[PDB]
C-alpha cells in the first residue's frame, strides 16, 4: 500500500486536532499510531482517540497540551506481501507562542584567520520565531550567493528557534553586510575593514 | 520490566560494516517478532524488516533486501541488524521495535509494535576525524568564540573553566559541503566589562584529544 498523510497540522492549546491517514481497502486493517516527540524514539499509544472511515483513519486529540507536541506516524500491514508500511508524517505544531523578531550578531574574522589565509564571516541568530528565515549575504550592496553555509532553525531551551550562517571566503576578497529576513521584517549588519 | 536497549552510537567511514545490536529483557525473549525501522535525518520511518527470536526467520523490506541481515542471539536475548557495506545514505537513527500488542481478530492478525529501543545513531562519512581551529570573536557587548573544521560534531565549550555560565550561548553546529562541522558560541555583557575582567574560551573535542583555551581580546 501507501499511506498519504497531511505534512503539517497547527492546533491553538485547549482545542481538538485531527491527523487523517489516507489509504484505500483499509476495511478490516486496524492503523496503528505512533507519536514521537522531536530527538526520542517513537511510542505507541484518554484525550488520544482514534477512528476508520474504511477509506480514511483519523487520530483525535481532544484538549491539546504542549506536551502533545511531536511528529504522528500511522501505519499498517499488507498481509499480501507481508510489507510494514508507514505514513509520511505530520508534524504538529501547538501555537502557544507570539511572534517575536531575530537578533542578530555579526563577528569579522579574528585576524589569525588571515594569517592562516582565510575569511570566514559569521552571522548569528537567535530568539526568532516563527521558525524559518531566509538569510542573504551581500559584499558592498550586491548580492553573494557564494560559499554560503546556513543551518536548520533550530529549537532553544528557552522555546524559540536559533540559527547561524558562515561565510567562506578569502582575505583577498575580505578588505576589497549580513540581511536576515523574517516575516518581510529585513534586519541588517555591518561590514568593514 | 520490558525494554529492548540497544548499542551506542557509531561514526564509520564508508565501506565499513555496521551492527547494531538491541537486547531484550523484562519478557520471554523468544515470544514474540522484532522489527527494524530506520530514520533518516530529519525525516519520517521507514521498516527494515522483521526477524523472529525463536524460529531465527527474518522478512526484509523490498528496498532493504541483500544489503542487510538480521540476527538472533537466544543465549543473550538480543538481536543483530547488520549493513555489511554502508555507504554516506545510510547516515541515520535505527530503532528496533518489539510487537507485543495484542491483536482483535482474525481479519487482521498483526501483533503491534509497542516497546521501542532507544535508538542508534549511525554517521556514515569519508571524512576523516579534524581537531577543531578556535579563532576568538572581537566585540551590551557581545564576545564569543568560533571553532571551525571538526569531526566529528560531538565537542564542548565552557567559559573561564566553568566560570560563565549566565549569558553564554552556544549555537549549534553546521555541517558544511566539505563534511566538515562548524560552530560559534557567543556571550552578551554589559557594554563595560572588557576592561574588569578578560574572558577565556574552552573548547574540549574528545574525538581528537584536542583541548584548546582561547584569551578572548579586542
Known amino acids: 500500500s501507501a499511506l498519504t498523510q497531511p505534512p503539517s497540522v497547527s492546533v491553538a492549546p485547549g482545542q481538538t486536532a485531527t491527523i487523517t491517514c489516507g489509504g484505500n481497502?483499509?476495511?478490516?486493517?486496524?492503523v496503528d499510531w505512533f507519536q514521537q516527540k522531536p530527538g526520542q524514539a517513537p511510542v505507541l499509544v484518554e484525550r488520544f482517540s482514534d477512528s476508520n472511515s474504511g477509506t480514511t483513519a483519523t487520530l483525535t486529540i481532544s484538549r491539546v497540551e504542549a506536551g502533545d507536541e511531536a511528529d504522528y506516524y500511522c501505519?499498517?500491514?499488507?498481509?499480501?506481501?507481508?510489507?510494514?508500511?508507514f505514513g509520511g508524517g505530520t508534524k504538529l505544531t501547538v501555537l502557544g507562542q507570539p511572534k517575536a523578531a531575530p537578533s542578530v550578531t555579526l563577528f569579522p574574522p579574528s585576524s589569525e584567520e588571515l594569517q592562516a589565509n582565510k575569511a570566514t564571516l559569521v552571522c548569528l541568530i537567535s530568539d526568532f520565531y516563527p521558525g524559518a528565515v531566509t538569510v542573504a549575504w551581500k559584499a558592498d550592496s550586491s548580492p553573494v550567493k557564494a560559499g554560503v553555509e546556513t543551518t536548520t532553525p533550530s529549537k532553544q531551551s528557552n522555546n524559540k528557534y536559533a540559527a547561524s550562517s558562515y561565510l567562506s571566503l578569502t582575505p583577498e576578497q575580505w578588505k576589497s553586510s549580513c540581511q536576515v529576513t523574517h516575516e518581510g521584517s529585513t534586519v541588517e549588519k555591518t561590514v568593514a575593514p | 520490566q520490558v525494554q529492548l536497549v540497544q548499542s551506542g552510537a557509531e561514526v564509520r567511514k564508508p565501506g565499513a560494516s555496521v551492527k547494531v545490536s538491541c537486547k531484550a529483557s523484562?519478557?520471554?525473549?523468544?515470544?514474540?517478532?522484532i522489527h527494524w525501522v530506520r530514520q533518516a535525518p530529519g525525516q519520517g520511518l521507514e521498516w527494515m524488516g522483521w526477524?523472529?527470536?525463536?524460529?531465527?526467520?527474518?522478512k526484509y523490506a523490498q528496498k532493504f533486501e541483500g544489503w542487510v541481515t538480521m540476527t538472533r542471539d537466544t543465549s543473550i536475548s538480543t538481536v543483530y541488524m547488520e549493513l555489511s557495506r554502508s555507504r554516506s545514505d545510510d547516515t541515520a537513527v535505527y530503532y528496533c521495535?518489539?510487537?507485543?500488542?495484542?491483536?482483535?481478530?482474525?481479519?487482521?492478525?498483526?501483533?503491534?509494535?509497542?516497546?521501542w529501543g532507544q535508538g542508534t545513531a549511525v554517521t556514515v562519512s569519508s571524512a576523516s576525524t579534524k581537531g577543531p581551529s578556535v579563532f576568538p570573536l572581537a566585540p551590551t557587548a557581545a564576545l564569543g568564540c568560533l571553532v571551525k573544521d571538526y569531526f566529528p560534531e560531538p565537542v564542548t565549550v565552557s567559559w573561564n573553566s566553568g566560570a560563565l555560565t549566565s549569558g553564554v550561548h552556544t549555537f549549534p553546529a553546521v555541517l558544511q559541503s566539505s563534511g566538515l562541522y562548524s560552530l560559534s558560541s557567543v556571550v552578551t555583557v554589559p557594554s563595560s566589562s572588557l576592561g574588569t575582567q578578560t574572558y577565556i574560551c574552552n573548547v574540549n573535542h574528545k574525538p581528537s584529544n584536542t583541548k584548546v583555551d582561547k584569551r578572548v581580546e579586542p
Open positions: 481497502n483499509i476495511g478490516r486493517k486496524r
Open positions: 523484562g519478557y520471554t525473549f523468544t515470544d514474540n517478532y
Open positions: 501505519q499498517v500491514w499488507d498481509s499480501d506481501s507481508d510489507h510494514v508500511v
Open positions: 526477524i523472529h527470536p525463536n524460529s531465527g526467520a527474518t
Open positions: 521495535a518489539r510487537a507485543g500488542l495484542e491483536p482483535r481478530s482474525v481479519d487482521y492478525y498483526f501483533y503491534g509494535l509497542d516497546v
